[PDB]
Design a protein around this nucleic acid. Structure first.
Length: 54
DNA sequence: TTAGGGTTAGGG
DNA sequence: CCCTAACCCTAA
């Protein structure tokens, strides 16, 4: 069953993009305790986030 | 391993 | 429901 991204999970992705740049999905995943999220999930979530503008 | 188009299932 | 966010597919 798919799982909605929490606000904490979302905030981790913003700080990861700030600290390491966009496209560095596997580097951002190792910098935060992402449980059950792959680097592709992070890439998809970011595209989702820029559409909703977050 | 990531980018970008495509797929799907669950929540608004 | 059914739209869209969370998924998948794959070239390079």
């Amino acid at each position: 069953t798919r799982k909605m991204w929490s606000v904490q999970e979302s905030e981790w992705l913003k700080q990861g993009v700030v600290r390491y740049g966009v496209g560095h999905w596997e580097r951002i995943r190792s910098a935060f305790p992402f449980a059950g999220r792959t680097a592709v999930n992070l890439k998809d979530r970011w595209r989702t986030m820029v559409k909703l503008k977050m």
